[PDB]
Each structure stands twice: as C-alpha cells, then as structure tokens.
C-alpha cells in the first residue's frame, strides 16, 4: 500500500502551482480557523503587550489535492508545507 500512497502523493504534487490559490480565478476560498490556547505568559503593562502560545489551525478546500483510492486521511510530513499553497494569515 506504500507504493500506492507514494504514487498518489507524486500524482498530487506534480503540476501543482504554488503561486495560484485554490480557485485562483474562481470564488474566494473559505478558511476555517481553530485556536487552542496553550498558555498566556506575560501580560506586561510596561511594554503594553501579552505573550500568547496557541495551537493555531486553519482548514480550507483545495480541489487539486483530491484522491479517491485511499480511504484514510494522509498525515504528511511538515516539509511539504513549502510545496502546498497555504493562506497568508498574519496578526
């Protein structure tokens, strides 16, 4: 099954345009957001800031990254984030 997952991932990443967003010329992609607050460290008055640690999480739909043979969710490595389109969220 490893060869099937291998050829499916190689099929997904081939021809994937990093510069274009899902539905680049189509409708705005909906990005759902979950935040798990881990801790708040330094609510400082002298610097007028607070330090916040969180498990920031985003979820959208890319129709290029769709597969049909494999019935389980693929948790890939963290180094494929440089190959997949991600939203440009900032604070």
């Amino acid at each position: 099954n490893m060869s099937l997952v291998k050829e499916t991932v190689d099929r997904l990443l081939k021809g994937y345009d990093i510069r274009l967003r899902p539905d680049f010329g189509g409708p705005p992609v909906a990005v759902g957001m979950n935040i798990d607050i881990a801790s708040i460290d330094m609510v400082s008055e002298v610097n007028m800031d607070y330090t916040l640690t969180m498990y920031f999480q985003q979820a959208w739909r890319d129709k290029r990254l769709s597969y049909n043979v494999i019935p389980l969710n693929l948790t890939l490595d963290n180094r494929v984030a440089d190959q997949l389109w991600v939203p440009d969220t900032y604070f």
Binding site: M2, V5, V9, D41, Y55, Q57, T75, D77, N78
Partner: protein, 324 residues
C-alpha cells in the same frame, strides 16, 4: 563508490521522507530514551526550568534495510535531512533549541534489519506550574511532556524503555536552592481537536532548601524584631529615643516587606514568608502602641518585658512545625 556509498545510494533511491513507515498498515512504534546532563535553574518568577538532555529515539523502517557484511551504518547529521523522523515536540516547552556548533549535534545509526537510532542534543525551557504557597519551603514535581505533533495515536505510538531516563552526576546540575529527589515516567492518551495523541511525561521531583532565604529575609527580620524588643529596657522619660527606635523599626519592617516581595512573583495569595513578615509587623506595631499607651498612662513595661519575647518564641514553634 565502495561499499557504504552504494548501500546508502541504494537505500535512498525511491525513498519518500514525507511518508512514515507503514503509512497504511500499522502505527509506528517508537522507543524513546533520554539522558539528562544538568537540570538548570528553576525560575520561579517566570515559572519554568531549564533542562539539557540527549534525546534519543528508536523505530523501524523497512525501506532502510540492507544485506551486507556491514552491520551498523554510523552516520552524522547530514543523513537526517534525507530520511523520515517523527515530529516529536515538547508540549510544555516555552522555548527550546538544539545545538549547532561546530556541526549539527545529531546522530543517526541504521542497522541492517531496518532499526534506526536518532539522537540529538536539546536545551529545553519547560513550563513547571510551581505553587508558591509554603514558599520558601515548597516542594514541586516538574514535568516534561512530549508527543508527536501531527501523527495521532493510530499512526505513531510512543513507548518507554525500562532504563530510558538516565540522569547525570546530579552535582554539575545548576539546581542551587533545590535538590532532585527522583524521577518517574508516565504515558497517556490526550484528546485534542485534531485527534488522539500519545503523550509521554517525565516528572522531576524537586524539593527546596531555605538556607538562602534564612539569610535573605528570616534572620534579618527576626533580628529587627529583636531590636524592637530592646525599647522596653529604655527608660520611659526618654521619649525621642524610644519613638526614634519605633519609627526606624516600622519603616525598615516595611522596607524588608518590600524587598523580600521582589524575589516573589506577582501572585495574589499569601505565602508563609509573607505570613511571617505580617506577624513580625503586627508584633512591632503592638510594641509601639504598648509604649505609646504606657507614655499616655504615665502622663506594664516589665509585663511586656517577658510577654513579647515569649509570644514570638511560641509563634516560631507554631510556624516551623506546621510548615515543616
């Protein structure tokens, strides 16, 4: 060319480091170990401790299997970036970093049956929720929780070795006012939004030593309130002398209340040190109002000459036994 070159070039062809071993077969069983070098300072105002370890992980990868006379491929950190490594992160670490001088301090050894050992050097500022009640006579159990970030329980299962946790000499440890009492390792499954994750915890039992605060705030305050009790030996007609002694004692009791609070963080509840400071302050304030009442009566000194040393002497038997 040679022997190890063709072995490595045959292992790494057709290899995807994105996919974990047995991606659609079974969870990857990872045996972790650790070797603490020197538990660093336990910071109480910021609520964390520093730890330096040799974090080592062991798993099986069937793609890294070779048949030759060579048993172990002892490699440096250059081969880390080519193979799969579990994304082990420390769940209570505020800030951590590996060591990168003169070379990345990582080890990678591959056996011929697919067994991979991966050891790296880490310095971790892990969060310990130190309860400062009882302080400066506190005792704490500081945890070190780690788990995989992205892979749930169905994909990576961590496990402990029997003698995994290895401490050092316990004297190069910069623990100054504390003392490592012992260690205990546990494992559990947490449930988060993404899924269920196997969490491995190491508890470090630390018990404090008050020798420092004795010379910081205890002795110092006790000698000030002993200096409060000599006013009774001064004659009652010497009014500016005894009121100068009184005002100096109360202003320096306020000063030592302010100074000893600088070591403590900005918590709301009261500590035993603050309770001792408050008892000394109300003792010296009672001494001043007793002298004042005597002065207004003459316009009981011997009575206090015994009562005020004795009330603190029974208090210290009450205070130290109940907190120790």
């Amino acid at each position: 060319e040679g022997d190890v070159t063709v072995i490595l070039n045959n292992l790494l062809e057709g290899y995807d480091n994105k996919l974990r071993p047995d991606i659609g077969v079974k969870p990857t069983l990872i045996h972790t170990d650790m070797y603490v070098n020197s538990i660093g300072p336990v910071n109480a105002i910021n609520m964390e401790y520093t730890i330096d370890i040799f974090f080592a992980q062991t798993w099986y990868d069937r793609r890294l299997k070779f048949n030759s006379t060579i048993k172990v491929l002892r490699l440096n950190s250059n081969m880390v970036g080519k193979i799969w490594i579990p994304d082990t992160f420390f769940r209570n670490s505020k800030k951590a970093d590996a060591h990168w001088i003169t070379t990345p301090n990582r080890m990678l050894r591959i056996w011929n049956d697919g067994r991979v050992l991966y050891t790296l050097r880490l310095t971790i500022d892990a969060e310990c929720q130190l309860q400062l009640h009882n302080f400066p006579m506190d005792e704490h159990s500081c945890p070190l929780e780690f788990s995989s970030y992205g892979y749930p329980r169905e994909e990576i299962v961590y496990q402990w070795k029997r003698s995994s946790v290895e401490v050092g000499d316990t004297r190069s440890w910069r623990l100054y006012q504390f003392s490592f009492v012992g260690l205990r390792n546990t494992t559990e499954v947490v449930k988060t939004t993404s899924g269920d994750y196997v969490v491995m915890s190491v508890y470090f039992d630390l018990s404090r030593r008050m020798g420092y605060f004795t010379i910081q705030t205890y002795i110092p305050c006790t000698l000030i309130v002993v200096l409060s009790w000599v006013s009774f030996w001064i004659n009652k007609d010497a009014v500016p002398a005894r009121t100068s002694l009184g005002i100096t004692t109360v202003l320096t009791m306020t000063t030592l209340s302010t100074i000893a609070r600088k070591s403590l963080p900005k918590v709301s509840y009261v500590t035993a040190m603050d309770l001792f400071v408050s008892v000394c302050f109300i003792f010296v304030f009672s001494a001043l109002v007793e002298y004042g009442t005597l002065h207004y009566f003459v316009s009981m000194d011997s009575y206090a000459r015994i009562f005020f040393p004795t009330a603190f002497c029974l208090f210290n038997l009450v205070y130290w036994v109940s907190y120790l």
